[PDB]
Structure 1
Amino acid sequence: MQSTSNHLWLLSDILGQGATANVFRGRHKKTGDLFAIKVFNNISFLDVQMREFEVLKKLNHKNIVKLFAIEEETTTRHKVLIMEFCPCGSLYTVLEEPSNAYGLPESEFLIVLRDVVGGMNHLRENGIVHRDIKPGNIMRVIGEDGQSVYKLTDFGTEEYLHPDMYEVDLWSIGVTFYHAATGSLPFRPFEGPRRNKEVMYKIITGKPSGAISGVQKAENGPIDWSGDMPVSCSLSRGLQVLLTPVLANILEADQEKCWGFDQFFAETSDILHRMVIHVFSLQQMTAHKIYIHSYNTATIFHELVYKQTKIISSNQELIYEGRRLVLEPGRLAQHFPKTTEENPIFVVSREPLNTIGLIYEKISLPKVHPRYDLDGDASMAKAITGVVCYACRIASTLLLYQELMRKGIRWLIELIKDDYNETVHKKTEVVITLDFCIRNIEKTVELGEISDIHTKLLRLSSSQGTIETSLQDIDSRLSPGGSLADAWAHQEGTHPKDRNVEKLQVLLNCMTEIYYQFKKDKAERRLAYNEEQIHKFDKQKLYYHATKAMTHFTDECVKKYEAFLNKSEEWIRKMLHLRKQLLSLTNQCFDIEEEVSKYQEYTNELQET
């Protein structure tokens, strides 16, 4: 409960403690405006210090916390610093939440990388060495437009250190972005870099120079490597493709072949300056995100789709808002239509495509031990709540996929019907032409060319008539009740009416409440006898919520998703066969449309002076 000239803070409002100064929740005394006070009790060693802090006062930027003033505590004469209060916490705080247990959401990851790189660029423009970049050293405030604003705070932890040290600037940034991407750290021995400290350094130094992750699965065991994000990471493959190279080449200890800052700020800005176009491969039931600059063309856009789904350019037939897209190779990306996850561009290819659907990592979940270990129960509750939160994220993605298939199929049928009606238009164009050449030849009536041409027109109507029978049978399929009807799609799956996502999130909210309370029990050390009781019963309720939610996820979701997906393969096959027939019959209405007139403009018109 110390005080100062201005400002004042309570001692129970301690938010962070560490080397030298702690950080409290202070006020302004004259006003009730909140502040963050750095106490600085250990004023060891040594004018120059107040000057190297006076420069920190003037420096103003969106991605840094601001030092407002320095003051002297009343009773102890300790150098206290007032700073911008960040009510949301730090980047490590949001990485503690089970929603980010397997990685930040895609949009908020862009907010992190934007604000982090922008803040470090502004610091290097003034020459402020940070080096020790950490999620704890990255705070979060809410912007005036909601959103989020991340700000650096401490400049001028062993887990985020370069190999040359660990007892060189871009190493910490790579480990933080990987931690933010997948919700887990890279380079991990067996259960933290604790006693396996010598194991950790063996992982950090001597790296395949192209990988990003290292992890052993057993005690004193082997280390697996990978140059890609894991399957569990909830980040679009359209973003991992251009995010892997920057990580794999800044985490290389060889300073000869490591990105400088100018190249780091160049590749990162390239990522941030792009826009996203949502594309759902209907034939494969896979959603995608194309990260493409606003000045690029549609040709490179089709190439980026080929890089994800292996669909050949110019064979990619695009659907949007129930209509075909018919894009041009010169149109800029900033002129494309809007794209959301719930309104993505659908993609067919007229070729047989392997339907794979969504690929997610099975977890199988952890066990709860009857041991009363509080810190063990806290760390266990954090992992298991992130697991069921992963199942909710997968369940919402599988529901989106099913509903998007229903929309893309419902449009695709109404698109085939339009092409079917266009073929009928060209059919009657040949019919009326065939009628006006038959009744004209039969009106005028050696004479061998008369019967020859007449029987040739009889051959035209004979093939044209069987084309009509084949078309009306095709419509009999497109008609309700027959094949290719989008009737099964309204069944066999899950719908927002079933509210499976909400049935899982109510148990997820009960879990995260128990987990938040278990983390409070960690700070309280020993608990009261009654609080020990409720900690035990809620510990068992965590297992009951897990068994009930996970069973509802595997028996309602997934299982019905597999049935809807297995039947989607059948309808896709029958749809490709339908479009192959209707296209061939449409071509048959074009060559015989040229066979007439040829047998009308000529051969019926003779000459005479």
Structure 2
Amino acid sequence: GSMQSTSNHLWLLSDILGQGATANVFRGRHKKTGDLFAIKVFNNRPVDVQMREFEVLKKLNHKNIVKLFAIEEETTTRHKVLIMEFCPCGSLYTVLEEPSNAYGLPESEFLIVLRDVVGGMNHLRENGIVHRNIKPGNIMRVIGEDGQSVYKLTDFGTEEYLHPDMYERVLRKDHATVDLWSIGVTFYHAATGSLPFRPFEGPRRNKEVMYKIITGKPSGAISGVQKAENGPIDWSGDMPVSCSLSRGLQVLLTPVLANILEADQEKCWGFDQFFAETSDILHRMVIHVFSLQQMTAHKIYIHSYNTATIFHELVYKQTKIISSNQELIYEGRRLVLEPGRLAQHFPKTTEENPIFVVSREPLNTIGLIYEKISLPKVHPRYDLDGDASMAKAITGVVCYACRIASTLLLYQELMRKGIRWLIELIKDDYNETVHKKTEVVITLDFCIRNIEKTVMGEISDIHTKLLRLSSSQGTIETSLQDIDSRLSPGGSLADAWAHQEGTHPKDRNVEKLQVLLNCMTEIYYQFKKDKAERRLAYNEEQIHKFDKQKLYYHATKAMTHFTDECVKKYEAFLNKSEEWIRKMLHLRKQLLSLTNQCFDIEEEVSKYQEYTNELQET
């Protein structure tokens, strides 16, 4: 294999990173240092319209823009090459081909994409550049020095991403929102793993159904899918259920998408509003909350400067528990947020260490809501392109199952923890009120009896009325004994079942699934190599056919384990939780009542304390 070069760099033609009509991108090295760079080489005026536009870029300096170092002359010809920042990881496209992201990026990653695309976008605009076609292949990923992805825009100056006016194909007239469209599609694709507008078959074969979908899209819809050949379009303003993003994030993103995926440029958002709206999301912090009675996890997207009041409102939006019914638990103890306490001063939370919320009012136990996705059928006919894409799809289904199994395990672990804490909490209450009582029994038994016992009627009415109180306290004692016994080891309120039901970390169900998944992923990546390599030799051919069966046998094993082990035991744990919750609410409601009687007893005794002493002559 051989190489072109310039004064300072050199590169294999085999080591190509990208191909456009205008130019090609290879990875090469600086000859003096050995350092990796992307070399952009143009295949072809006016001569200096380019040296100028090249110069403008060489000046651009920004975190979210692939850097243009220098411009050089290839040695063989006086052709211009651009030396650009090499990004070993590739593009957002590469990321979304990972079977792991078949149903959307992980939330944190999606947020980085959102941030960086928006940042790069702005920078161009600030400098007045318009990037006509933003798409995942345009958006380069790099590992930052802190290990987090940094996304970077390159190649400024695809059907599925072109605006309706653009899809037709008259140079856009005279000047951007059209950019917002492809950003709209890009973000949706990153959020869900899918293109938002999908004629049956492909957009490619059905360019016409596709334009009909995009133009005739009702307002608010963010997707339209044709599920059958020549069938109708299903519209939605919602994220698909299979999407990983939290309800907290979904609720914020959806409106941004609806408003930048608008056909009439009359009512598109306009950039600034888009910048303002996206930044409002990006500037929020996340507080993790888990709803114990609903068996649901939540992310609350809240500004640093927002109050607890707003926090309760946000929680209410996702749970339907009104502010005043919201009872908070954190790290074993009650959390009491003063209304005006800023979110920046709330205690630190994670998905594994959330703030729990409980109500004294009945809620339906929801649990995790997820798509039921079954394996596609494997087509026995051998095909290097077909099998690669099928391998991707089936591995995608198993990863999803794996992701859901992990969430299912988390939900049960949080439940077990939440329940443990709440029981010790109720237990405190029982002891707080059981103290008070013994402390007021002290007045009946010590004062009224013993005080007036010391030496016409009303007195006959007082000693007897008081007896009704000790009588009333006796009704209290036996109702507390009943609650204590319920809170104890034998009790109807016991923890035990939660250790007996569902699945536990030590079961290693997630790990068992990942092992199977890793087997499928090696095969998928090989089918990726088998595709690129256009024909296999006899043995390799056979081996490829074998592994096509192995994929399926691995995928079936996984789905069976998922449904019969993970889902089954999970549903058993949930149904038991439903019952334990109802008993708990009823118990707390009795104890409350026993607590209020204690106050009502306590204060009448607090009146007759004085009645012992009359005025005296003197």
Q: TM-score scaled to structure 1, two decimals? A: 0.98
How far does the alpha carbon of each residue in 1:346-402 deviate from its partner, in whole angstroms, 9 at most, with x for none? 111100111111110001220111100111111111111010000000000000000
The SS at the match of 1:511 is helix
Q: How far 1:607 sits from its partner (Å)? A: 4.0
How far does the alpha carbon of each residue in 1:271-299 deviate from its partner, in whole angstroms, 9 at most, with x for none? 00000000000000000000011101111
State how 1:318-467 maps to structure 2 within 5 Å: 318-445=328-455, 447-467=456-476
Distance 1:184 1:385 in 2: 16
Distance 1:66 1:382 in 2: 33
The SS at the match of 2:198 is coil
Gaps of 5+ in 2: 169-177
Question: In 2, are the aligned partners of 1:131 and 1:170 still within 8 Å (CA)?
Answer: no
Q: How far 1:509 sits from its partner (Å)? A: 0.8
Q: How far 1:601 sits from its partner (Å)? A: 1.5
Distance 1:581 1:572 in 2: 14
Partner of 2:477: 468
Q: How far 1:606 sits from its partner (Å)? A: 4.2
Distance 1:597 1:115 in 2: 67
Question: In 1, are the aligned partners of 2:219 and 2:258 still within 8 Å (CA)?
Answer: yes
Partner of 2:105: 104
Distance 2:372 2:612 in 1: 73
The SS at the match of 2:605 is helix
Q: How far 1:608 sits from its partner (Å)? A: 3.4
The SS at the match of 1:155 is coil
Q: In structure 2, do the counterparts of structure 1 residues 114 and 108 end up closer, same or farther at CA, with 3 Å as the change threshold?
A: same
How far does the alpha carbon of each residue in 1:15-70 deviate from its partner, in whole angstroms, 9 at most, with x for none? 2223221111100001011000012122xxx4231111011111110000111011
Distance 1:377 1:606 in 2: 102
Q: How far 1:131 sits from its partner (Å)? A: 2.3
- Of the candidates 246, 249, 252, which is equivalent to residue 259 of structure 2? 249
Question: Are 1:565 and 2:565 matched, yes or no?
Answer: no
Distance 1:453 1:245 in 2: 69
Q: How far 1:73 sits from its partner (Å)? A: 0.9
Q: How far 1:438 sits from its partner (Å)? A: 3.2
Partner of 1:68: 69
How far does the alpha carbon of each residue in 1:470-526 deviate from its partner, in whole angstroms, 9 at most, with x for none? 101100000112211000001111010000000000011111111111011111111
Question: In 2, are the aligned partners of 1:274 and 1:294 still within 8 Å (CA)?
Answer: yes
- Of the candidates 206, 219, 238, which is equivalent to residue 228 of structure 1? 238
Gaps of 5+ in 1: none
Question: Are 1:317 and 2:327 matched, yes or no?
Answer: yes
Q: How far 1:602 sits from its partner (Å)? A: 2.4
Distance 2:50 2:81 in 1: 13
How far does the alpha carbon of each residue in 1:581-600 deviate from its partner, in whole angstroms, 9 at most, with x for none? 00000000001100102111
Partner of 2:564: 555
The SS at the match of 1:80 is strand
Distance 1:209 1:16 in 2: 37
Q: How far 1:13 sits from its partner (Å)? A: 1.0
Question: In 1, are the aligned partners of 2:191 and 2:243 still within 8 Å (CA)?
Answer: yes
- Of the candidates 212, 215, 218, which is equivalent to residue 205 of structure 1? 215
The SS at the match of 2:235 is strand
How far does the alpha carbon of each residue in 1:215-255 deviate from its partner, in whole angstroms, 9 at most, with x for none? 00111111000001000011101001011111001111111
The SS at the match of 1:35 is strand
Distance 1:566 1:208 in 2: 40
Q: How far 1:306 sits from its partner (Å)? A: 1.1
Q: How far 1:603 sits from its partner (Å)? A: 4.8
Distance 2:549 2:79 in 1: 48
Q: In structure 2, do the counterparts of structure 1 residues 68 and 602 end up closer, same or farther at CA, with 3 Å as the change threshold?
A: same
Question: In 1, are the aligned partners of 2:448 and 2:608 still within 8 Å (CA)?
Answer: no
How far does the alpha carbon of each residue in 1:444-465 deviate from its partner, in whole angstroms, 9 at most, with x for none? 24x4233221111211101111
Deviates more, 1:374-383 or 1:75-84: 75-84
Question: In 1, are the aligned partners of 2:132 and 2:157 still within 8 Å (CA)?
Answer: no
Q: In structure 2, do the counterparts of structure 1 residues 605 and 417 end up closer, same or farther at CA, with 3 Å as the change threshold?
A: farther
Q: How far 1:257 sits from its partner (Å)? A: 1.3
Question: In 2, are the aligned partners of 1:170 and 1:250 still within 8 Å (CA)?
Answer: yes
**What is the number of residues matched between the two proteins?**
605
Distance 1:82 1:105 in 2: 33
The SS at the match of 1:165 is helix
Distance 1:483 1:95 in 2: 50
How far does the alpha carbon of each residue in 1:77-132 deviate from its partner, in whole angstroms, 9 at most, with x for none? 32111100001100000000011110000001110011110111011001111020
Distance 2:593 2:417 in 1: 27
Distance 2:160 2:479 in 1: 70
Q: How far 1:442 sits from its partner (Å)? A: 4.6
Distance 1:595 1:413 in 2: 32
Question: In 2, are the aligned partners of 1:41 and 1:79 still within 8 Å (CA)?
Answer: no
Question: In 2, are the aligned partners of 1:322 and 1:411 still within 8 Å (CA)?
Answer: yes
Distance 1:607 1:23 in 2: 108
Question: In 2, are the aligned partners of 1:40 and 1:80 still within 8 Å (CA)?
Answer: yes
The SS at the match of 2:357 is strand
Q: How far 1:562 sits from its partner (Å)? A: 0.4
Question: In 2, are the aligned partners of 1:378 and 1:522 still within 8 Å (CA)?
Answer: yes
The SS at the match of 1:15 is strand
Distance 1:308 1:131 in 2: 38
Distance 2:89 2:179 in 1: 27
- Of the candidates 603, 606, 614, which is equivalent to residue 605 of structure 1? 614
The SS at the match of 2:587 is helix
Q: In structure 2, do the counterparts of structure 1 residues 409 and 605 end up closer, same or farther at CA, with 3 Å as the change threshold?
A: farther
Distance 2:76 2:277 in 1: 51
Partner of 1:528: 537
Q: How far 1:443 sits from its partner (Å)? A: 3.3
Q: How far 1:440 sits from its partner (Å)? A: 3.4
Distance 1:439 1:420 in 2: 27
User: What is the root-mean-square deviation in Å for CA atoms of aligned residues?
Assistant: 1.1
Distance 1:222 1:608 in 2: 100
The SS at the match of 2:361 is coil
The SS at the match of 2:30 is coil
Q: How far 1:439 sits from its partner (Å)? A: 4.0
> Identity percentage over the alignment?
100
Q: In structure 2, do the counterparts of structure 1 residues 469 and 200 end up closer, same or farther at CA, with 3 Å as the change threshold?
A: same
Question: In 2, are the aligned partners of 1:351 and 1:576 still within 8 Å (CA)?
Answer: yes
The SS at the match of 1:83 is strand
How far does the alpha carbon of each residue in 1:142-195 deviate from its partner, in whole angstroms, 9 at most, with x for none? 101001100001112111001012142210000000000001101100121122
Partner of 1:239: 249
Question: In 2, are the aligned partners of 1:280 and 1:347 still within 8 Å (CA)?
Answer: yes
Partner of 2:123: 122
Deviates more, 1:480-489 or 1:427-436: 427-436
Q: How far 1:300 sits from its partner (Å)? A: 1.1
Q: How far 1:322 sits from its partner (Å)? A: 0.9
Distance 1:498 1:90 in 2: 37
Distance 1:178 1:594 in 2: 63
Distance 1:308 1:109 in 2: 21
Partner of 2:31: 29
Q: TM-score scaled to structure 2, two decimals? A: 0.97
Distance 1:523 1:169 in 2: 32
Distance 1:477 1:460 in 2: 26
Question: In 2, are the aligned partners of 1:87 and 1:141 still within 8 Å (CA)?
Answer: yes
